[PDB]
RNA sequence: UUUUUU
């Protein structure tokens, strides 16, 4: 749908800055106008109240452009007098997007006075005194609970003359109290306007004289991971190709031999092949296990699927960006078909068809007609292992050759020949190469998020959410490959691509400690390189916070760590560390859930309240907050934590 | 707006109990159908997924009636094939409402097998094993986070035979983990159906042979507080009339003396008069300070404005209910114009006009046309004092005779004749008597709620919310009294009447300890009598929990308590108690907000982190959780806390 | 925001 203007904040003419708001659209009008992208309302003022399906925030007009945050608006069109207006500017790096200001909209003029006395206008038309501190930061004269600032992103910071200094994007909090604000300065809007809206990164970058990082944006099947490195190799270059998937990485061996007559080296956890060829395929995980960049080994490093936001890819790419030049490379290529900000466009091979309530097989509130999947080879994406098992058991009950696939299972359970309805989670994508006659997509994803809940410390929460544009493109892309495909779906939308949660940063530190023998300080250097690099997925900068937390987690019980590592579940280090503190305190775990199985051996001996460090799931036992590590982590919580409102 | 069926949960018809969801309507259709109240979709199944504008939950058909929870549906109609269906049963006491089941709806059969193995069907078609343990309680075999049961209000609990045992209304939580569930049993549906559909409480109750608690539901202006007690008195009875407000109580006295020829006793903080007459007027607050019911003094006690959910009224009515019979009363009358479940209905003398965006005067997102208040006498309700000052300031500066009124101010500032526009908070309700040509209503108000946030204990927060039906009808009733009147409004709905927050219970214990020398045990007795009485406002039963908290708050500093009581702000006991702990620790208060003003003179001596007991506002200072009282309150948080989901 | 008891 489109972003919709549903009100405005009117600013005063002069003398003491004041504001009041007007609501011009209800809920029904917002939903309708969002669906059609056609809004015939007349626009007034320089600050608009805008809304999506589920969220409401602000947009500020400067220099004929209506500006807001990428994290709120994504890549969405704005509903306009003659239909949806396509974004004219999209700067994920700066968390900034802009549409051509509709007629009737007035702009603020960029500030030039250099005043540091600023005034933030909130979505409730409050005018809040702010003292400028940096190019992008200002302190609140009166700290306020972060909830006071909710929905105010996109709102203007004004100088005393009423000129635009920037737009609000996030609150800097101390234990949930906003003491400062982070904003996108006007200078950043200027820079965005005068960058060329069309940068072509569709051709393989040329190897430069001195080190550069370049982007390669090319459609799936265009040969980013095969044709491109083989071309480079032909020119005499040594090339390393990094990819998140073991199945994909192995697959490159055979394909390169027959397609380009190169027998590349192959590096994965499960299998290493050294031929001495000038092209090497590695997973990010194996690259990290190997210690990163070996000096002099490569001229070119291609980070394939560089849009991926799993911790391994992020930490691996950060390692490349920090180490490549010193290891002698001249070119780092960040390769993807779907860079941040990208949206899913129609595909000629793929017919897209909404599911209805007609059909014999219930599926996420809708239904799948049996004739749609009886005969042929089909893939159905579910959000969870349980739903896969269920659906597969049911389809099997109707004599449908159905198999469930997900993490844990071996790919051999999928027959590479003959009819079959595969019911899988996203684990399919990294574990199995191959396409289908149709894809049916629940359009949701299970994701992890951090909450700085202070009860006592933080919580890592798992929730089911609407899929983003990368998820949609990749699930859909399992059909229509050199064949006419069909894509069936529950919902038509897609969340904005190219952002990830702070919890993923937590995962990186965890992996560094657990698998890769990285001190938290070293993990930070790598993640800092990632964060400093334009054109990649973006995340709140909580590096100093997470580093501080892991830095305090000393003398882990090597035995428990071995067990969580082997067991293969999330946060092996944090889980092993809580188990360690428990055992040394001679106390029980937060629960006897499976997450804590490494403790069973001690079950009869462990008693009293849990010295809880943080929340990684439900806590059923009683809790004590007396442990020194709990107190240390609680102390870490007082750090500036920038969060979106 | 109506409740709208937006999907269904289809139950297995044989063998093991299973379920799946069918979604029949999107957000758009929902909003449209809610507004029109007409829904032509065929209805199928026994379990419906239902939504309003803000929330979604379940409804279950039993015995030809579609049942759900009052806390979800309020008194709302259901969208039906020929228009809105009004509720056939509205039982606020049991949190149960029912519509006559539409055509196509099947009904679950009542369970009469006594099976203790139950299955709860969730809004997501999950089937959850539950062990029955009481008439209305069941334990989860696998405790889950409360979030999991979100939106399952109204879902069925089934026995192994697929019969209906009851409907889910709330979770019983241990530190946020649902360990058991509260449900409305089918027996309550049975008793509901077997009591009359209509009842009349419009006439003053006859004095019964033996002690009875009775209800008087009669419109404002009908003489509930004057004509009624006069008539009782004329029959030879001694009457005590209790009312929340001093102004009201003094007003009735003066009136009764001239228009009903008797000089009533009067008991208020500011004015107490003993005339020896048979009728006495008192505030609930003075009645409490008097120690409650005095033996033999009254035949009849009229608890006027018994819908009121302020702590003084609730504790005062609970005291009447615990004490009256033993004190020799013959009759308690619970009198109100707006009992729980009531709604604001169209009023002949009142034309109701929605504000639009056309007007010179900005008002809560809309505007007031200057020609609607330029000549005459009008009343404007704002949610805060600030707004009242600011709107008065603007209006006067536009040539309109505008006056601001709210708590603290002299009532006389209101011209009793001649063109005026009064901008007021709800203080006008008790504080000033008299009509206006029209009322303009912001439709919101300020309320407090508790969050069991465990960070470390609980939080009381103040928020601005949409008004309820009591609020709407009361504000609207200030015009159209005998004459023609106009009611103008920002928004058209109203939240259900007759419910209050657990934070009010907290305030009752606070006032018990601060003002009335009640031990928490004694307060629990009076509150329990209130909660056990049918037909009064309802609240979650957290008496044991709150009693336990206050029981641990011993040896308060009398000086701090004297100051917080005198300053008139909420929770004087909790505030003075946190101050006591800080002062004795030489530690600062949570912040230097005015809430903590009693510590201002000690400021130079206070250092280090606040030993935080609970959160009553923003906490700016660092905190420690080591204090014994903090630890005691943290332990209180382990009690069963029943909460809606 | 209302309301009360000192
Ligand atoms: Zn300026
Ligand atoms: Zn039964």
Q: A575-613 burial, b for 16+ CB within 10 Å, e for fewer?
A: bbbbbbbbbebebbbbbeeebbbbbeeeeeebeeebbbb
Tell me how far apart the alpha carbons of residues A532 and B168 are, in angstroms, rounded to a whole number.
51
Q: Token pair of A71, please? A: 């994290």
Are A142 and A130 found together in one domain? Answer: yes
Three-state secondary structure call for residue A573: helix
Are A628 and A562 found together in one domain? Answer: yes
CB-based burial label for A141 (10 Å; 0-12, 13-18, 19+):
exposed
Q: In A96-185, where does DSSP find H-type helix?
A: none
The residue that minimises its CA distance to C1' of C4 is B285
Cα separations in angstroms, B542 against B153, B173, B529, B633, B642: 20, 12, 14, 15, 8
Q: Token pair of A124, please? A: 């409730």
Distance A348 CA to C4 C1' (A): 73
Tell me how far apart the alpha carbons of residues A626 and A8 are, in angstroms, rounded to a whole number.
50
* B184, B58 contact by CB (below 8 A): no
Residue among B228, B214, B249, B413 at smallest CA distance from B329: B214
Q: In the 8-state DSSP scheme, what is residue B639?
A: S
Three-state secondary structure call for residue A73: helix
Distance A232 CA to C2 C1' (A): 76
Angle between helices B572-585 and B502-514 (to 10 degrees): 70
Residue among B67, B85, B89, B253 at smallest CA distance from B157: B67
Nucleotide nearest to B566 (CA to C1'): C6
Q: Token pair of A459, please? A: 């919580």
- Alpha carbon B626 to its chain's center: 36
Angle between helices B27-36 and A27-36 (to 10 degrees): 140
Single residue among A342, A372, A399 that ends a domain in this structure? A342
Tell me how far apart the alpha carbons of residues B490 and B439 are, in angstroms, rounded to a whole number.
12
Are B356 and B330 found together in one domain? Answer: no
Angle at B446 between CA A178 and CA A124, to 5 degrees: 45
Q: Is B20 left (phi over 0), alpha (psi -120 to 50) or beta?
A: beta
Q: Token pair of A146, please? A: 């972060």
Q: Token pair of A8, please? A: 């405005």
A512 is catalytic: no
* A59, A98 contact by CB (below 8 A): no
Q: In the 8-state DSSP scheme, what is residue A557?
A: -
Cα separations in angstroms, B506 against B555, B562, B570, B575: 19, 19, 11, 13
Dihedral angle, C-alpha A313, A317, A320, A321, nearest 10 °:
-170
Q: Token pair of A192, please? A: 């965005």
Three-state secondary structure call for residue B84: strand
Residue among B152, B10, B9 at smallest CA distance from B69: B152
Q: For residue A130, what is the enclosing H or E element?
A: strand A127-132
What CATH number should be reported for the domain holding residue B287? Answer: 3.40.50.300
Reported as half-sphere exposure (CB side, CA atoms, 13 A), residue A433 has a value of: 11
Residues of B serving a catalytic function are: 71, 95, 151, 153
Breaks (C-N over 2.5 A) in chain B follow: none
Cα separations in angstroms, B398 against A87, A118, A484: 43, 30, 70
Cβ contacts of residue A513 below 8 Å, gap of 6+?
A520, A523, A550, A553, A556, A573
* B289, B511 contact by CB (below 8 A): no
Angle between helices B558-567 and B572-585 (to 10 degrees): 140
A153 is catalytic: yes
Tell me how far apart the alpha carbons of residues B600 and B583 are, in angstroms, rounded to a whole number.
11
Neighbours of A263 (CB within 10 A): 15
* B65, B154 contact by CB (below 8 A): no
Residue among A334, A316, A346, A264 at smallest CA distance from A498: A334
Residue carrying structure tokens 């439709």: B443
Are A370 and A380 found together in one domain? Answer: yes
Cα separations in angstroms, A643 against A178, A502, B125: 9, 10, 35
Are A204 and A325 found together in one domain? Answer: yes
* Residue A345 alpha carbon to ligand 1 centre in Å: 42
* Residue A156 alpha carbon to ligand 1 centre in Å: 12
Q: Is A221 left (phi over 0), alpha (psi -120 to 50) or beta?
A: left
Three-state secondary structure call for residue B7: strand
Tell me how far apart the alpha carbons of residues A170 and A172 are, in angstroms, rounded to a whole number.
7
Residue carrying structure tokens 């928004």: B491
Q: For residue A251, what is the enclosing H or E element?
A: helix A246-260
Tell me how far apart the alpha carbons of residues A120 and A130 are, in angstroms, rounded to a whole number.
7
Distance B616 CA to C6 C1' (A): 25
Three-state secondary structure call for residue B409: coil
* B639, B601 contact by CB (below 8 A): no
Tell me how far apart the alpha carbons of residues A445 and A383 are, in angstroms, rounded to a whole number.
5
* A441, A476 contact by CB (below 8 A): yes
Tell me how far apart the alpha carbons of residues B211 and B514 are, in angstroms, rounded to a whole number.
32
Q: Determination method here? A: X-ray
Q: Which residues face A54 on adjacent strands?
A: none
Residue among B11, B23, B30, B151 at smallest CA distance from A365: B23
* A66, A30 contact by CB (below 8 A): no
Distance B243 CA to C4 C1' (A): 11
* B60, B47 contact by CB (below 8 A): yes
> By CA distance, what is B53's nearest residue in A?
A27
Nucleotide nearest to B386 (CA to C1'): C1
Are B472 and B577 found together in one domain? Answer: no
* B45, B33 contact by CB (below 8 A): no
- Whether the beta carbon of B284 falls within 7 A of nucleic chain C: the reply is yes
> By CA distance, what is B6's nearest residue in A?
A365
CA distance between the termini of chain B: 22
Breaks (C-N over 2.5 A) in chain A follow: none
Q: Is A134 left (phi over 0), alpha (psi -120 to 50) or beta?
A: beta
Tally C-beta pairs within 8 A across A and B: 72
Q: Is A163 part of any known ligand binding site?
A: yes
Tell me how far apart the alpha carbons of residues A179 and A36 are, in angstroms, rounded to a whole number.
40
Tell me how far apart the alpha carbons of residues B27 and B50 are, in angstroms, rounded to a whole number.
12
* A98, A192 contact by CB (below 8 A): yes
Q: How far is B175 from chain A (nearest CA, A)?
A: 8
Contact A22 B638 (CB under 8 A): no
Question: Greatest CA span in chain B, whole angstroms?
Answer: 77
List the beta strands (DSSP E) in B52-205: 56-62, 65-69, 78-80, 83-85, 89-91, 96-100, 117-121, 127-132, 137-145, 156-158, 164-174, 177-185
CA distance between the termini of chain A: 22
Number of domain units in chain A:
5
Are A490 and A519 found together in one domain? Answer: no
Tell me how far apart the alpha carbons of residues B570 and B367 are, in angstroms, rounded to a whole number.
33
Distance A608 CA to C3 C1' (A): 45
Cα separations in angstroms, A37 against A3, A32, A47, A354, B59: 8, 8, 20, 20, 35
* Residue A505 alpha carbon to ligand 2 centre in Å: 51
Resolution in angstroms comes to 2.0
Q: Token pair of B479, please? A: 């015009």
Residue carrying structure tokens 């500093």: B557
> By CA distance, what is A7's nearest residue in B?
B365
Tell me how far apart the alpha carbons of residues A38 and A81 are, in angstroms, rounded to a whole number.
6
Are A104 and A136 found together in one domain? Answer: no
Tell me how far apart the alpha carbons of residues B108 and B177 are, in angstroms, rounded to a whole number.
30
State residue A63 phi and psi, 5-degree precision: 55, 45
Q: How far is B10 from chain A (nearest CA, A)?
A: 10
* A531, A319 contact by CB (below 8 A): no
CB-based burial label for A81 (10 Å; 0-12, 13-18, 19+):
middle
Tell me how far apart the alpha carbons of residues A229 and A256 are, in angstroms, rounded to a whole number.
10
- Whether the beta carbon of B446 falls within 7 A of nucleic chain C: the reply is yes
Tell me how far apart the alpha carbons of residues B54 and B35 are, in angstroms, rounded to a whole number.
13
Q: Which residues face B203 on adjacent strands?
A: none
Q: In the 8-state DSSP scheme, what is residue A64?
A: T
Tell me how far apart the alpha carbons of residues B334 and B228 are, in angstroms, rounded to a whole number.
12
Cα separations in angstroms, A53 against A4, A152, A355, B440, B453: 9, 17, 21, 31, 29
List the beta strands (DSSP E) in A431-499: 438-441, 444-451, 459-466, 485-489
Residue among B571, B265, B220 at smallest CA distance from B429: B220
Q: Which residues face A351 on adjacent strands?
A: A486
Tell me how far apart the alpha carbons of residues A120 and A140 are, in angstroms, rounded to a whole number.
9
CB-based burial label for A62 (10 Å; 0-12, 13-18, 19+):
buried
Partner B contacted by A446 (CB < 8 A): no
Cβ contacts of residue A473 below 8 Å, gap of 6+?
A337, A338, A342, A344
Residue among B152, B46, B165 at smallest CA distance from B117: B165
- Whether the beta carbon of B429 falls within 7 A of nucleic chain C: the reply is yes
Tell me how far apart the alpha carbons of residues A56 and A70 are, in angstroms, rounded to a whole number.
13
* A404, A361 contact by CB (below 8 A): no
Tell me how far apart the alpha carbons of residues B89 and B99 are, in angstroms, rounded to a whole number.
7
Are B514 and B612 found together in one domain? Answer: yes
Partner B contacted by A136 (CB < 8 A): no
Q: B83-106 burial, b for 16+ CB within 10 Å, e for fewer?
A: ebbebbbbbbbbbbbbbebbeebe
Single residue among A441, A469, A500 that ends a domain in this structure? A500
Tell me how far apart the alpha carbons of residues A642 and A452 are, in angstroms, rounded to a whole number.
11
Q: Token pair of A350, please? A: 């793929």
Q: Token pair of A46, please? A: 């320089």
Tell me how far apart the alpha carbons of residues B24 and B49 are, in angstroms, rounded to a whole number.
9
- Alpha carbon A6 to its chain's center: 28
Which range of residues forms the domain containing residue A87? 1-108
Single residue among B500, B535, B562 that ends a domain in this structure? B500
Q: In what order do the strands lie in the sheet with A65-68?
A: A19-23, A4-11, A47-51, A56-62, A65-68, A96-100, A89-91
Are B485 and B623 found together in one domain? Answer: no
* A573, A549 contact by CB (below 8 A): no
For residue A112, which ligand has an atom nearest its CA?
Answer: 1
Q: For residue A574, what is the enclosing H or E element?
A: helix A572-585
* B642, B172 contact by CB (below 8 A): yes
Tell me how far apart the alpha carbons of residues A524 and A545 are, in angstroms, rounded to a whole number.
10
Tell me how far apart the alpha carbons of residues A399 and A391 are, in angstroms, rounded to a whole number.
13
List the beta strands (DSSP E) in A322-384: 331-336, 350-354, 361-363, 366-368, 377-381
Partner B contacted by A417 (CB < 8 A): no
Q: Checking DSSP bridges between strand A331-336 and strand A212-217, what pairing results, if any?
A: parallel
Cis amide linkage into residue B439, ω under 30° from 0: no
Q: B322-339 burial, b for 16+ CB within 10 Å, e for fewer?
A: bbbeebebbbbbbbbbbb
* A182, A136 contact by CB (below 8 A): yes
Cα separations in angstroms, B633 against A30, A274, A548, B209: 46, 64, 30, 48
Q: Token pair of A309, please? A: 């936001």
- Whether the beta carbon of B304 falls within 7 A of nucleic chain C: the reply is no
Residue carrying structure tokens 């920038």: A642
What CATH number should be reported for the domain holding residue A144? Answer: 2.40.10.10
* A20, B363 contact by CB (below 8 A): no
Q: Could you please report the per-residue DSSP string of B510-563? A: HHHHHTS---HHHHHHHHHHHHTSTTS-B----HHHHHHHHHT--S--HHHHHH
Q: Token pair of A345, please? A: 């466009």
Partner B contacted by A366 (CB < 8 A): yes
For residue A160, which ligand has an atom nearest its CA?
Answer: 1
In chain B, what residues touch A386 (CB-CB under 8 Å)? none
Are A284 and A161 found together in one domain? Answer: no
Angle at B600 between CA B594 and CA B603, to 5 degrees: 130
Of B residues 104-143, those with CB within 7 angstroms of nucleic strand C are none
Tell me how far apart the alpha carbons of residues B182 and B164 are, in angstroms, rounded to a whole number.
15
* Residue B318 alpha carbon to ligand 2 centre in Å: 38
Are A317 and A270 found together in one domain? Answer: yes
Tell me how far apart the alpha carbons of residues B522 and B547 are, in angstroms, rounded to a whole number.
9
Three-state secondary structure call for residue A261: coil
State residue B491 phi and psi, 5-degree precision: -125, 155
Neighbours of A15 (CB within 10 A): 7
């Amino acid at each position: 749908g489109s972003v919709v203007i549903v009100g405005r904040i009117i600013l005063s003419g002069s003398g003491s800055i004041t504001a009041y708001s007007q609501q011009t659209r209800g809920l029904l009008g917002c939903i309708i106008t969002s669906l059609t992208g056609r809004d015939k309302n007349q626009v007034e003022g320089e600050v608009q109240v805008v809304s999506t399906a589920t969220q409401s925030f602000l947009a500020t007009c400067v220099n004929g452009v209506c500006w807001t945050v990428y994290h709120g608006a994504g890549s969405k069109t704005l509903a306009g007098p003659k239909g949806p207006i396509t974004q004219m500017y999209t700067n994920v790096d700066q968390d900034l997007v802009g549409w051509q200001a509709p007629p009737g909209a007035r702009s603020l003029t960029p500030c030039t006075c250099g005043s540091s006395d600023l005034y933030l206008v909130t979505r409730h038309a409050d005018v809040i005194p702010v003292r400028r501190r940096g190019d992008s930061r200002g302190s609140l004269l009166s700290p306020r609970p972060v909830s006071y600032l909710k929905g105010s992103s996109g709102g203007p910071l004004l100088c005393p003359s009423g000129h635009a200094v920037g737009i609000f994007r996030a609150a800097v909090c101390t234990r949930g109290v906003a003491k400062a604000v982070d904003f996108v300065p006007v200078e950043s809007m200027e820079t965005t306007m005068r960058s060329p809206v069309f940068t072509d990164n569709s051709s393989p970058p040329a190897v430069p004289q001195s080190f550069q990082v370049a982007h390669l944006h090319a459609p799936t099947g265009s040969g980013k991971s095969t044709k491109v490195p083989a071309a480079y190799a032909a020119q005499g270059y040594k090339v390393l190709v990094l990819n998140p998937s073991v199945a994909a990485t192995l697959g490159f061996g055979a394909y390169m031999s027959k397609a380009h007559g190169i027998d590349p080296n192959i590096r994965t956890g499960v299998r290493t092949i050294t031929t001495g060829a000038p092209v090497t395929y590695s997973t990010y995980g194996k690259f990290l296990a190997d210690g990163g960049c070996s000096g002099g080994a490569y001229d070119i490093i291609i980070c394939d699927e560089c849009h991926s936001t799993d911790s391994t890819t992020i930490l691996g790419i950060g390692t490349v960006l920090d180490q490549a030049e010193t290891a002698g490379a001249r070119l780092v290529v960040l390769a993807t078909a779907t860079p941040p900000g990208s949206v899913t466009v129609p595909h000629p091979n793929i017919e897209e068809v909404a599911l209805s309530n007609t059909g014999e097989i219930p599926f996420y509130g809708k239904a799948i007609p049996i004739e749609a999947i009886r005969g042929g080879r089909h893939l159905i994406f579910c959000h969870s292992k349980k739903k896969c098992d269920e659906l597969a058991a049911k389809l099997s009950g109707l004599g449908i050759n159905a198999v469930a696939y997900y993490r844990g299972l071996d790919v051999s359970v999928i027959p590479t020949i003959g009819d079959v309805v595969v019911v899988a989670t996203d684990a399919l994508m990294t574990g199995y190469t191959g396409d289908f006659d149709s894809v049916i997509d629940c359009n949701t994803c299970v994701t992890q998020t951090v909450d700085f809940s202070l009860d006592p410390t933080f919580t890592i929460e798992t929730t089911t959410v609407p899929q983003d544009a990368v998820s949609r493109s990749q699930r859909r892309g399992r059909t229509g490959r050199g064949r006419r495909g069909i894509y069936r779906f529950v919902t038509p939308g897609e969340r904005p691509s190219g952002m990830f949660d702070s919890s993923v940063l937590c995962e990186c530190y965890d992996a560094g400690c657990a698998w890769y023998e990285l001190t938290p300080a070293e993990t930070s250097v790598r993640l800092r390189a990632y964060l400093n690099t334009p054109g990649l997925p973006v995340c709140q900068d909580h590096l100093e916070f997470w580093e501080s937390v892991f830095t305090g987690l000393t003398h882990i019980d090597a035995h428990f760590l071995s067990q969580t590592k082997q067991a293969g579940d999330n946060f092996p280090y944090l889980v092993a560390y809580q188990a360690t503190v428990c055992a040394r305190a001679q106390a029980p775990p937060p629960s006897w859930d499976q997450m804590w199985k490494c403790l069973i051996r001690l079950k009869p001996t462990l008693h009293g309240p849990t010295p809880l460090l943080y929340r990684l799931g439900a806590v059923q036992n009683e809790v004590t907050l007396t442990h020194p590590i709990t107190k240390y982590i609680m102390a870490c919580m007082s750090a500036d934590l920038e969060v979106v409102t």
